[PDB]
Design a binder for this molecule. Structure first.
Ligand SMILES: O[C@@H]1[C@@H](O)[C@H](O[C@@H]2CO[C@@H](O[C@@H]3CO[C@@H](O[C@@H]4CO[C@@H](O[C@@H]5CO[C@@H](O)[C@H](O)[C@H]5O)[C@H](O)[C@H]4O)[C@H](O)[C@H]3O)[C@H](O)[C@H]2O)OC[C@H]1O
Ligand SMILES: [Cl-]
Ligand SMILES: [Cl-]
Ligand SMILES: [Cl-]
Ligand SMILES: [Zn+2]
Ligand SMILES: [Zn+2]
Ligand SMILES: [Zn+2]
Ligand SMILES: [Zn+2]
Ligand SMILES: [Zn+2]
Ligand SMILES: [Zn+2]
Ligand SMILES: [Zn+2]
Ligand SMILES: [Zn+2]
Ligand SMILES: [Zn+2]
Length: 371
């Protein structure tokens, strides 16, 4: 099956249109890149901001709101009949730090006096409410799906002990969802989003958290499974079990940040795309074949599958593609093997079904057929 230009291959959204939308994460510069635009128009019917809707992009100083970059995604989406997802209202990752400073500019995590800690809690929660309010009041008629909180459960199975949690405890999660529902109304759909949702003890900690929150009337419509996965891990059986277990709570599932890395963890990458052997693309294609067959089997529990980029020329996985060199300067990709130094984030991953030249990969054929 040939390595033809994606730009006029059979449309990926159309293949799956009764099963789930097919989305892509974008940067605004891609909306001014001819090829990226034609890719979005041709293959996708859902869109998400990779970065420009994060808290630090939207409100980098209190009261200073930058909607200009988000607005461009929204406009493009509306003009092309795409669903939009909002990524994300609340996250621990370089939030703007002003959220977590007390009335004197001191970090709130340092306060020892209980009455002052409680005032800080209330103050952070008010700030959270205003951030959400302002965003949802602006986009509630345009944006259907919302990542309300991101990565709030730790890999150890405990609530992630971020400044949100240290200052406000569990109420930050409750307040985030209540606020989104209050200002956005009943027709926006609210998600909790996380990675390694398939993995214990995180998976059961997430299930227990969401079950409790719903029992308490906190409005949560679904779970976003970031799905930053590998060729051989996690298994399809474990993916299946995860999806089924949340759907049994009455939750929607979205696959929100799908990519299939060529590597393991910590990754030992090839230094360029050219160096990735052909067989890796075939192993990737068989993985995508199995994965999309599974998503199709569960299509009544999954409303969306979104890739965390467009084509292999741009992927955040490159920032993790560390290149290992032996003493003679040869590249090392075997996870156990000797090496002398590492160049962090300098290699090249290849995670999508579309190549860096915008031609289809063997993974594309694996998911566009009906076998
Ligand atoms: O442009 C960039 C943006 O794209 C970027 O977007 C955000 C990045 O993605 C989301 O967060 C990251 C998800 O991946 C996590 O790493 C995990 C760590 O755990 C590993 O688990 C192991 C895998 O191998 C097994 O065998 C082992 O037993 C497991 O424990 C897993 O492989 C990794 O993927 C990162 O820590 C997260 O940050 C986020 O929501 C997107 O918004 O943001 C930055 C920007 O520069
Ligand atoms: Cl190349
Ligand atoms: Cl398939
Ligand atoms: Cl990126
Ligand atoms: Zn389309
Ligand atoms: Zn379409
Ligand atoms: Zn090449
Ligand atoms: Zn090259
Ligand atoms: Zn569906
Ligand atoms: Zn990017
Ligand atoms: Zn190529
Ligand atoms: Zn090519
Ligand atoms: Zn197939």
């Amino acid at each position: 099956k040939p390595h033809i230009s994606a730009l006029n291959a059979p449309q990926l959204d159309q293949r799956y249109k009764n099963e789930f939308t097919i989305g892509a994460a974008v940067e605004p510069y891609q909306l001014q890149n001819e090829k990226d635009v034609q890719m979005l128009k041709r293959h996708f019917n859902s869109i998400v901001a990779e970065n420009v809707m994060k808290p630090i992009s939207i409100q980098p100083e209190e009261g200073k709101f930058n909607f200009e970059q988000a607005d461009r995604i929204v406009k493009f989406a509306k003009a092309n009949g795409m669903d939009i997802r909002f990524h994300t209202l609340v996250w621990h990752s370089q939030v703007p730090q002003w959220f977590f400073l007390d009335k004197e500019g001191k970090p709130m995590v340092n306060e020892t006096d209980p009455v002052k800690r409680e005032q800080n809690k209330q103050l952070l929660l008010k700030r959270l409410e205003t951030h959400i309010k302002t965003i949802v009041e602006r986009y509630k008629d345009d944006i259907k799906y919302w990542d309300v909180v991101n990565q709030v459960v730790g890999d150890d199975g405990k609530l992630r002990n971020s400044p949100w949690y240290q200052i406000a405890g569990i109420d930050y999660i409750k307040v985030a969802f209540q606020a989104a529902r209050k200002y956005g109304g009943d027709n926006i759909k609210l998600y909790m989003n996380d990675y390694n949702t398939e993995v214990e003890p995180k998976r059961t900690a997430l299930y227990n958290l969401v079950k409790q929150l719903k029992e308490e009337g906190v409005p949560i419509d679904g779970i976003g499974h970031q799905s930053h996965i590998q060729i051989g891990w996690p298994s399809e059986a474990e993916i299946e079990k995860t999806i089924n277990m949340f759907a049994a709570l009455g939750l929607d599932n979205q696959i929100t940040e799908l990519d299939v890395s060529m590597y393991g963890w910590p990754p030992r990458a090839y230094p360029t795309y050219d160096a990735i052997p052909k067989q890796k693309f075939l192993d990737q294609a068989a993985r995508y074949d199995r994965l999309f067959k599974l998503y199709e089997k569960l299509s009544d529990k999954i409303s969306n599958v979104t890739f965390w980029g467009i084509a292999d020329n741009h992927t955040w996985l490159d920032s993790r593609a560390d290149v290992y060199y032996d003493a003679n300067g040869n590249v090392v990709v075997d996870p156990n093997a000797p090496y002398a130094k590492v160049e962090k984030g300098k290699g090249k991953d290849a995670p999508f079904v579309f190549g860096p030249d915008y031609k289809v990969k063997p993974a594309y054929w694996a998911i566009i057929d009906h076998k």
